[PDB]
């Protein structure tokens, strides 16, 4: 519709970045998409799509694909921290982040993709924005568009201290791979005491598992950056928990993969300014708590992508975009919240217990995913 926009640089590969190249691709644009790692995040951890979501996979040709690669669990067991089993658990879908990610990014084969490009500066003008990557590359793009994460590189270059703050929902969340000592078969336990949760899960791969922590704490890891100050963080709040917990901790230095950090949400008034914009995480994060990034950032992407096809310019459908988003990234990050503060038991719950809650969470969620309408364009 509008011209002389074609060409658009969007930076990270993830969730967002891939799929907003998708759609701006089909509706005629001219994007390359740049990322400061080698390589794509291979693996990780287990993500959801809900609601509307789902409905851009579909529209998109990989709902299909994503069933096909999607989690594959037999069952949940909760347990106390003797070890006595409590109790067992044996259209939206569950789906490793590092698979989805794979299956966006072969639907945009077409399209230039640069890795270990990071980024040295941003200038914006009138009519386009120069880009200087930190290997000596400089290249003007009509509009830029960061795709690139919670610690967005770009957020921090492009906004001022004043047009956004992240905050901090009081929780820590920690992943790091184990041998699958316990010889779990497609099977997940957990134990839930004290506002921490423990977990132990083995899906795919019957020689590997996965360890998991989340907690409420008003401390804060010494350094929370470094990784050992992280580790020595969980040693604390960790040791006699119960069930596997010191064995975990033991492991913890054999992982490789660690990942740990404070839950967090971006807060901004506006995610543009000028000729630039963010999407996904980098903008609007829900925050792990909410199970609604991976949702939020597809939506993010379809809605930006809609509405640089429909309207005159790109100040207008910048404009649309954080009008349409915002009631949804309120009521994601709203739930995020609640999670943060109302969600983990002080003791372990029975099944009748649990039921109850879980019915409860639904609710709530449904108010997050359902919050709005998905834009026809």
Same mark, same amino acid.
Request: a negative charge; charged letters at 25%; one cysteine or more.
């Given at each position: 519709?509008?011209?002389?926009?074609?060409?658009?640089?969007?930076?990270?590969?993830?969730?967002? @970045?891939?799929?907003?190249?998708?759609?701006?691709?089909?509706?005629?644009?001219?994007?390359?998409?740049?990322?400061?790692?080698?390589?794509?995040?291979?693996? @990780?951890?287990?993500?959801?799509?809900?609601?509307?979501?789902?409905?851009?996979?579909?529209?998109?040709?990989?709902?299909?694909?994503?069933?096909?690669?999607?989690?594959?669990?037999?069952?949940?067991?909760?347990?106390?921290?003797?070890?006595?089993?409590?109790?067992?658990?044996?259209?939206?879908? !569950?789906?490793?982040?590092?698979?989805?990610?794979?299956?966006?990014?072969?639907?945009?084969?077409?399209?230039?993709?640069?890795?270990?490009?990071?980024?040295?500066?941003?200038?914006?003008?009138?009519?386009?924005?120069?880009?200087?990557?930190?290997? @000596?590359?400089?290249?003007?793009?009509?509009?830029?568009?960061?795709?690139?994460?919670?610690?967005?590189?770009?957020?921090?270059?492009?906004?001022?201290?004043?047009?956004?703050?992240?905050?901090?929902?009081?929780?820590?969340?920690?992943?790091?791979?184990?041998?699958?000592?316990?010889?779990?078969?497609?099977?997940?336990?957990?134990?839930?005491?004290?506002?921490?949760?423990?977990?132990?899960?083995?899906?795919?791969?019957?020689?590997?598992?996965?360890? @998991?922590?989340?907690?409420?704490?008003?401390?804060?890891?010494?350094?929370?950056?470094?990784?050992?100050?992280?580790?020595?963080?969980?040693?604390?709040?960790?040791?006699?928990?119960?069930?596997?917990?010191?064995?975990?901790?033991?492991?913890?230095?054999?992982?490789?993969?660690?990942?740990?950090?404070?839950?967090?949400?971006?807060?901004?008034?506006?995610?543009?300014?000028?000729?630039?914009?963010?999407?996904?995480?980098?903008?609007?994060?829900?925050?792990?708590?909410?199970?609604?990034?991976?949702?939020?950032?597809?939506?993010?992407?379809?809605?930006?992508?809609?509405?640089?096809?429909?309207?005159?310019?790109?100040?207008?459908?910048?404009?649309?975009?954080?009008?349409?988003?915002?009631?949804?990234? !309120?009521?994601?990050?709203?739930?995020?919240?609640?999670?943060? !503060?109302?969600?983990?038991?002080?003791?372990?719950?029975?099944?009748?217990?649990?039921?109850?809650?879980?019915?409860?969470?639904?609710?709530?969620?449904?108010?997050?995913?359902?919050?709005?309408?998905?834009? !026809?364009?």
């Amino acid at each position: 519709m509008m011209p002389h926009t074609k060409k658009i640089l969007v930076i990270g590969a993830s969730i967002a @970045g891939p799929a907003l190249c998708y759609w701006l691709n089909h509706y005629g644009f001219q994007p390359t998409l740049v990322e400061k790692n080698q390589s794509t995040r291979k693996g @990780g951890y287990a993500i959801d799509l809900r609601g509307i979501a789902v409905d851009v996979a579909k529209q998109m040709g990989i709902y299909d694909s994503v069933c096909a690669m999607r989690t594959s669990l037999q069952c949940v067991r909760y347990v106390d921290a003797a070890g006595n089993l409590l109790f067992e658990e044996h259209d939206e879908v !569950e789906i490793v982040r590092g698979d989805l990610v794979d299956i966006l990014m072969k639907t945009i084969t077409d399209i230039p993709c640069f890795y270990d490009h990071a980024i040295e500066s941003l200038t914006q003008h009138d009519d386009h924005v120069t880009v200087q990557f930190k290997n @000596g590359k400089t290249e003007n793009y009509d509009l830029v568009i960061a795709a690139d994460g919670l610690h967005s590189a770009t957020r921090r270059m492009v906004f001022s201290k004043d047009d956004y703050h992240l905050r901090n929902l009081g929780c820590y969340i920690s992943v790091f791979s184990i041998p699958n000592y316990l010889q779990l078969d497609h099977c997940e336990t957990l134990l839930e005491a004290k506002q921490k949760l423990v977990s132990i899960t083995s899906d795919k791969d019957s020689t590997k598992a996965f360890a @998991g922590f989340m907690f409420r704490s008003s401390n804060s890891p010494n350094y929370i950056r470094d990784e050992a100050s992280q580790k020595d963080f969980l040693r604390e709040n960790f040791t006699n928990h119960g069930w596997e917990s010191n064995k975990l901790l033991s492991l913890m230095n054999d992982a490789n993969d660690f990942y740990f950090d404070a839950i967090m949400q971006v807060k901004m008034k506006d995610w543009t300014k000028g000729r630039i914009a963010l999407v996904g995480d980098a903008g609007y994060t829900p925050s792990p708590l909410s199970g609604q990034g991976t949702s939020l950032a597809l939506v993010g992407a379809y809605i930006l992508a809609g509405e640089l096809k429909t309207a005159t310019d790109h100040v207008a459908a910048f404009a649309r975009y954080n009008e349409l988003l915002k009631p949804y990234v !309120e009521a994601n990050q709203a739930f995020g919240v609640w999670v943060s !503060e109302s969600f983990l038991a002080d003791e372990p719950l029975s099944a009748e217990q649990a039921e109850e809650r879980n019915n409860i969470v639904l609710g709530i969620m449904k108010k997050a995913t359902h919050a709005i309408e998905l834009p !026809e364009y």
